Amino acid sequence: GNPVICLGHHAVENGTSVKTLTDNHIEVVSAKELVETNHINELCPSPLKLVDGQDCDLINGALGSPGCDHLQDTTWDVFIERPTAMDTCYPFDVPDYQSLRSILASSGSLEFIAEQFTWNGVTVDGSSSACLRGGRNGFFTRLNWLTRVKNGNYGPINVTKENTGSYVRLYLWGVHHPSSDTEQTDLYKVATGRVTVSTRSDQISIIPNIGSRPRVRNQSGRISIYWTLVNPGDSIIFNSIGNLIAPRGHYKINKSTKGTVLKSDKKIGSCTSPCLTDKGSIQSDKPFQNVSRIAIGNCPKYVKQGSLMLATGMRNIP
Amino acid sequence: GNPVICLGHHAVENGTSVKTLTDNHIEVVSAKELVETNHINELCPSPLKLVDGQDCDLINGALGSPGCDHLQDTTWDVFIERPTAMDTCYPFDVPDYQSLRSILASSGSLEFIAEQFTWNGVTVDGSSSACLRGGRNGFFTRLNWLTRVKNGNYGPINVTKENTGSYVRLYLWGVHHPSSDTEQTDLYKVATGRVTVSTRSDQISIIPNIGSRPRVRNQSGRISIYWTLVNPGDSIIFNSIGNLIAPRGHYKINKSTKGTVLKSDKKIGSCTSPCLTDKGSIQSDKPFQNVSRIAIGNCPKYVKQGSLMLATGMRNIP
Amino acid sequence: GNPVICLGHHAVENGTSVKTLTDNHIEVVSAKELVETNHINELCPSPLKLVDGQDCDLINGALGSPGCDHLQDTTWDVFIERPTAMDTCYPFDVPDYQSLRSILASSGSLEFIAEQFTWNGVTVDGSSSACLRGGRNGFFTRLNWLTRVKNGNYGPINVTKENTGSYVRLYLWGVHHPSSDTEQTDLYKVATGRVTVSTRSDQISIIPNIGSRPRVRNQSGRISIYWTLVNPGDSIIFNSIGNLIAPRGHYKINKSTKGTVLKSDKKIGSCTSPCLTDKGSIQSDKPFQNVSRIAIGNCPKYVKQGSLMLATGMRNIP
Amino acid sequence: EIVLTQSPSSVSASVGDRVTITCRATQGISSWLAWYQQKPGKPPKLLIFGASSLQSGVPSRFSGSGSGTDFTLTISSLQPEDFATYFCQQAHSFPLTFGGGTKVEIK
Amino acid sequence: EIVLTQSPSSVSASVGDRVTITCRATQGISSWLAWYQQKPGKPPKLLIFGASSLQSGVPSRFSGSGSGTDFTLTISSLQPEDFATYFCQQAHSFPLTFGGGTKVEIK
Amino acid sequence: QVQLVESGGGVVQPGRSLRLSCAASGFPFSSYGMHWVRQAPGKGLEWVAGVSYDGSYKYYADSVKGRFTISRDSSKSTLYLQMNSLRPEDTAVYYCARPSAIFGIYIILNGLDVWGQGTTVTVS
Amino acid sequence: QVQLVESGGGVVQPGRSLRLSCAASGFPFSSYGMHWVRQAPGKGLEWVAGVSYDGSYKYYADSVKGRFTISRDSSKSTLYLQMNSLRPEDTAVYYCARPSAIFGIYIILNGLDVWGQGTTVTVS
Amino acid sequence: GLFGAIAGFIENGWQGLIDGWYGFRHQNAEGTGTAADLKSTQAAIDQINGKLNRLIEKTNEKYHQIEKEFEQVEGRIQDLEKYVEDTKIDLWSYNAELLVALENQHTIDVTDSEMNKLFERVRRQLRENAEDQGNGCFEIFHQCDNNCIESIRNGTYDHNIYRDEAINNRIK
Amino acid sequence: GLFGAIAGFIENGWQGLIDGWYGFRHQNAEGTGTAADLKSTQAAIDQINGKLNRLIEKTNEKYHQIEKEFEQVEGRIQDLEKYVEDTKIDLWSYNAELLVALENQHTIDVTDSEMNKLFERVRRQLRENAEDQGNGCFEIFHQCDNNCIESIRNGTYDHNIYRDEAINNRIK
Amino acid sequence: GLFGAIAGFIENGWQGLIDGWYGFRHQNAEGTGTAADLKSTQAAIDQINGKLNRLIEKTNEKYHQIEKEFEQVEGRIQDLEKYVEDTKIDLWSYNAELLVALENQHTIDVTDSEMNKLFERVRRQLRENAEDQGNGCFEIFHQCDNNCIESIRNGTYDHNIYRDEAINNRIK
Ligand SMILES: *[C@@H]1O[C@H](CO)[C@@H](O[C@@H]2O[C@H](CO)[C@@H](O)[C@H](O)[C@H]2NC(C)=O)[C@H](O)[C@H]1NC(C)=O
Ligand SMILES: *[C@@H]1O[C@H](CO)[C@@H](O[C@@H]2O[C@H](CO)[C@@H](O)[C@H](O)[C@H]2NC(C)=O)[C@H](O)[C@H]1NC(C)=O
Ligand SMILES: *[C@@H]1O[C@H](CO)[C@@H](O[C@@H]2O[C@H](CO)[C@@H](O)[C@H](O)[C@H]2NC(C)=O)[C@H](O)[C@H]1NC(C)=O
Ligand SMILES: *[C@@H]1O[C@H](CO)[C@@H](O[C@@H]2O[C@H](CO)[C@@H](O)[C@H](O)[C@H]2NC(C)=O)[C@H](O)[C@H]1NC(C)=O
């Protein structure tokens, strides 16, 4: 009956299963999940500065369509476009639409630096029954619809603006595509218009085309939206003999530095989370996640696995 | 002379060499190769549904050029373009050619939904000696060449179609670029044509350009092919005063879901393999491969190495 | 007093700290740094063949602007663009500027294969005071400014060149955008010019727009630069009734094969290094680096860490 | 015993400053450090166990570091409620040691 | 011993059905399971060894799964010649055990 | 939910005795080891006593060895701090603290998760 | 090419003996261990006997221990199943089977690669 | 495990051991008992926590990215934007799958090692006064009361004290 | 190897061992013979097969991708489409090279562990009746017939049986 | 370490050991001395150099790439060209961080093993003529002059020579 001293290890009744290099199902004592699979279902307004357009996409907000009166002078870390966003103004397309959106979203600012132009020889402040602002004919809050002098000519426009400031200026302008040769002559009196916007390094000129497009808000014509950047020291010139949709100023190119846009339909709560997804915010300390590939902020890395169990204990053998 | 019991391990005469963290050449008893380097040299028609254009590239098949009669209503998991494919019709270019061929290849279907149009005030079904179908002047089977009324005007076209179905419609149309001002007036009677195809959300308008191009099939003119998508509820409008190459219907936008195009020259065999490459099919259970970076299907991951030996046995020491 | 034999391991006074899977700070005897952080501050001209434009960007060199006389017929493994590069000729823009730069840089050659054209019915060798070559009105060395016959017409241009060689010909041409209806008629006598360059498989046609642009070198007009590739067996046709900026030959498409362009301001030394960066060359045997993401040649892989210490010795326990 | 030395003994800072605190012992206590927040007249609240593991519910701005010899408590963006006295705890072997206290006043 | 338990004991199915069979033992037999095909009056043929490794020449529709405790034999697209009785084998230690047989009939 | 309630702090004279108590609520008290930590008023925290889960292994600070006695009750789920031979050096705000639990086991030697409200012991 | 031929199956009375043989062809027989597996007619497969490559280590089923005797021969490359004390329980279709070779070792304890045609043993 | 202590010559674990990961379990004249060992338990937790803290360092923070969901087919550019994102997700998913599978193989090896570390420490303590039964227990060939047992568990056991007694009880 | 049994104190392997990965080789009065060991052989194969199955799971299946061969220079877009593919191929090639080298380093250490595992098992069996010669063989200090040898190889060897003979033959 | 020799039962290192990585340190009648051990030192160095040569193979050579710096906002194309480069750098930085941490964890374990390897070798040499003190030192129970010491360090020591003297000094 010699004394015996035994050496062993602890175990538990129900252990967890983890993967190793040599097995798919090894039961260990304790394990921690490394894939986050839950989201709040609400977008947390902290610490990231959010902006809800909530009826206005980002471009409609930049142009100043009726619904977007609340987006003026807004600044954001993340802009939130909604699926319920609706056009409210004259029908328009944007060549390279996705780029202008990305340029606006990255700047993270809708501060419109207003400018006073002298459009010599044209009627200004045109409106359209397709773009109603309070049951009244209106237009884009950041665009000026120029038309021929009353019973007169479309006096040629040769306006210029020097970039004195230290920042790069984004000018938003457009070209009106009429629906009939009557409209083109009723408005600008030239049978064929021309719009030429240029800087010292890059340029773009458009001659508008007449024709019928599907009626949107009882309008067959269109307005093509373009944009021109002006670096410090450079000068921009708006030269047009017809169909110019003039700007009222410029936006300020800011630094990306957590500035982007997120397309989601979730409401903005009062929670706090440094990670946003289209499905809602993520509150986790886990490295990975299967919530969504769309992840803005300090987020876990999106993976395809829904569960990756890290062994935090020895082998469990009851 | 006490009894001795020894403990050891097996060995073989000729072992295999493997890499480890601390050596480039370690001889182990047994090893498996993880990099597949062999291919069948034929394309297996199972389980992936293949389609051989075999004289017609995808776009030529979509337009309906002479050779592509056999491609009508075909469906595929992988379309196969050949290097021996040849243009057979009126010379044409396609702005963003690779985008429209990657839309037709993703959809994985050449089902043409035929529609009846009423092009009011024009001759229809024009043909060219540069596009022969059985030693006879023909044209793209999915396009309608519209010219002026015989000894008359090019009655202005304002045809529309509303998307009533639940799918997105892909319309294929074009614009004729004549060779001389004679041909333009001889065909559409206007000095300068115009083609404006539009929906409610996106538009495109083209005014053709007269001039000499290199003779292709004895033709100096060209046709610029364009495409317009129409979402459910939207409407498309073909508005033109000249030079319109009209459609005869639309294609149905399907789901990607293993639908693509592979540019190969290998014959389609009778084998079975879930992985296709430009160099033929791969039959393997290995994780990696050095056959080709072009791999479609359940394929091993392409690597640069030609051999990665995994050790499946102990250290061999004879 | 039995004899004792002890077994141990060496140690040092000051060890090095490394990271493991289970600790951020473990002191081992010795350790090697894997991230290179130092660069020469000069660009080594060996073994890579370098070319300094040094007042001329690549595109200006390809066109032949005044400063770029030293870039003629140069070949390079790496072209070097300086920040001090300046425009020196008639103001010009390039649609898809970045692509033409990429095509020229990857070819790694400014060998200009000169050709003799017969521009029938025009004055040749035009020059502008905006483009001075030795206090004298000059022009791009690789472009030919065509204007109407002296007190005559702009006799239509219908020139064609067949590709007989085995290589792909890059033709650099342009379109002049005049500043006023006077200039257009003063130069080419048509109210509206046209430039149509085309091959058998791809084409492009431009009708120039008239109007004011900001004065650059006392010139309000512009010249849009385009390019056309011609495969062996194919022919290119220059058709123009006005405003054509004709070529003087073509460039030979070469193989990428260490051919690119690097934007740096560091001087070219006399050192030797198989790796270049925008901040200078890297002379290291380390796997990683934090010098610059811009790395050309046999370079360490850019990482975000500044110090990754690999343990090259046992644990150091004094 | 094992002696803990907190440096500095006190510090004043405005809201938003990058605050740095050190706990400093003698033996190898590799990972057994515990940082505590303390308001006057209130019991402590465990902030960081394991010398880096953030406690459940504690904001992510609180961060701990160090291993074996040199320990550190870092706070990225200080908040008005964070004005408190901070204590580190040795947990390698008995007896349990604590520090001299590192308070954060107003500046 | 080690007792194997095949489920179900028989099944009827048409050509093209997703057939599932289970082998079910007592001890940790790691990954040592061998599935066999058997036509009446004919000796067995090894279909799956290692409980997952497809035998050479056996079509890719036959597939095996399981580890340690629960085992499974799955057939994706049944064919007319695949009508047979199926047996699983324990191979962890002596004695060698087989199952009760799982026959596939015509439906 | 989970919290620890303290009691026993009062005004006492040097040389005599007191007993403080810490009643647990909301967690398996008998599974954890427990600690008593005293904040000497004016100074910082000072660990004084600590007991294992069963009550067989008891750990004391060098200042109170052979002077204080810790114990615990499983039926009542209460932690007893029996103080003998008091003196004004032992004047402190007493805290009962619960060492944190780690992945699988309930170690006695770790950081302290939950504290009591703090009951003051004054020795005049 | 490679296969196993069986023989010896006949009609026998209980209590007596038989000897079944399994001739190998097309593989290194003396390198593999070998097994006898019997399919009781009506029931499934039932392992009965197995032998190592050299023939020094023999493994039997609990129903036939001390009753049957397995043996092999390198010179004839044949497998012997000497059955004594037969009884109708032993009535079965006998199969000689070959355990699969894995990695580089010719293990005795694995799945069975090659089978014989099946020789029926009837005991009335 | 690589050492074969856990799931090896240590048949199973002890659920009654709740204050530690490794412990002693004795049988002497006065009775029986079980106590955890701190050093071994502490070392194992340190290396698990040490690798847990390494896996949490928040280093992924991106705001402006590329679009990852599209409402209309576009072709070349969309094909690239989708392929770029898919290639990334694949690589990170492999990085994660390999990391977990590898950190677990090491974790189970570390704990198996720490169990063997404790056993080897006790083996070297008694060092002629006990024999390895094989199941992780030591037959102590001398009287060892509870104070003697504690001296083994806190590392103060002097083998020279019982060497004469033990060698005699083993050899004869 | 980390344990130094294979390519260590076990000088070399046995090519006559064809029925197993680890085996016994004895010399008693009746003669000599070699037998494989099943448990050690099975544990090694299970861990090799286990990691083999892990490396075959078919997870890569893409159909629509980006073009990876070009018949004309284009510039910006083509440069990106190439750089994306090149970046992917390099990363996967590294992921493969590191995987093989790492799994092999582990594989060789596992087989070296299982060899030492078997040796340590037999060491604990005899446990005063034999001594470690060093080469992986035990000098059994008592008569051990073939039935005694098999008792060591199937784990039924009772050391108390021969303890009296064995100690006497060792000490004197 | 996984074997617990270095930073384990070997208390600390010897800075006087300047001619190797592992060595002997004895005390016999004639005096005391230290000598390195080549075999253990070489095996460690060859496995550190073997993994050092693996990490230097120059395989990264790219010349034409995509632009990674931009002087003007462009939008969609620039977003992708940036996001591609960012995705790559992240994946390589992880490939580098995991590589170092893993190679170090293995390195420290290899050296800990080579230490335990040497200790085990000498243990098998003396056999019953020495006992494990625990600190990595063996108490040799017989007279062992410097030639006897050298016989232990170069592997020629015959235990059967001092077996009678040694057992007698241990048991009594
Ligand atoms: C071209 O065709 C369209 C439709 O075929 C014409 O537009 C429609 O006008 C009616 C008027 O009651 C509206 O209700 C429809 O909504 C319009 N259709 C569309 C698609 O917008 C259009 O007027 C025609 N153009 C010309 C110049 O006659
Ligand atoms: C993330 O992964 C989890 C699995 O790890 C997914 O969910 C589970 O789905 C199964 C059905 O297959 C249910 O039986 C489980 O109850 C679910 N568990 C949980 C925790 O959700 C989950 O759907 C994945 N999420 C996404 C967005 O893909
Ligand atoms: C895939 O890799 C293999 C090598 O691992 C390449 O093939 C061999 O090429 C060498 C010459 O460099 C010959 O000596 C060998 O006989 C070849 N072996 C085989 C099996 O082909 C092979 O070419 C690579 N495949 C591709 C498509 O590059
Ligand atoms: C590369 O990484 C190093 C760090 O490893 C960076 O530099 C050091 O910067 C710190 C301050 O943050 C100084 O205290 C050190 O003295 C610096 N050391 C060296 C060697 O520079 C370095 O700036 C990084 N380089 C780049 C280009 O990012």
Numbering used by the authors:
A (entry chain E), B (entry chain C), C (entry chain A): 8 to 325
D (entry chain J), E (entry chain H): 43 to 149
F (entry chain I), G (entry chain G): 31 to 154
H (entry chain F), I (entry chain D), J (entry chain B): 1 to 172
From the paper:
Anti-stem antibodies exhibit much broader cross-subtype neutralizing activity in vitro and in vivo by inhibiting the low pH-induced HA conformational rearrangement, hence blocking membrane fusion.
To provide insight into the structural basis of the broad neutralizing activity of PN-SIA28 against group 1 and 2 IAVs, PN-SIA28 Fab fragments or Fab variable fragments were prepared and co-crystallized with H1-HA (A/swine/Guangdong/104/2013), H14-HA (A/long-tailed duck/Wisconsin/10OS3912/2010), or H18-HA (A/flat-faced bat/Peru/033/2010). We determined the structures of the PN-SIA28 Fab fragment alone at 2.5 Å and of its Fab variable fragment complexes with H1, H14, or H18 HA at 3.2, 3.4, and 2.6 Å resolution, respectively. The heavy chain paratopes of PN-SIA28 in the PN-SIA28/H1, PN-SIA28/H14, and PN-SIA28/H18 complexes are composed of large portions of CDRH2 and CDRH3, whereas the light chain paratope of PN-SIA28 in the PN-SIA28/H1 complex is composed of large portions of CDRL1. In the H14 complex with PN-SIA28, the light chain uses its extra CDRL2 to contact helix A. Notably, S52 (CDRL2) and S53 (CDRL2) are positioned within the hydrogen bonding distance of helix A N53. However, the substitution of Ser (H14 and H18) for His (H1) at HA1 amino acid 38 could potentially weaken the binding of PN-SIA28. Aside from the amino acid differences at position 38, the different orientations of His at HA1 amino acid 18 could also affect the overall energetics of binding between HA1 and the CDRH3 loop. Both the imidazoles of H18 from H1 and H18 HA1, which form hydrogen bonds with N20 of HA1, interact with the CDRH3 of PN-SIA28. In contrast, the imidazole of H18 from H14 HA1 shears off, which does not make a hydrogen bond with V20 of HA1 and has no contact with the CDRH3 of PN-SIA28. This seems to be a common trait shared by group 2 HAs.
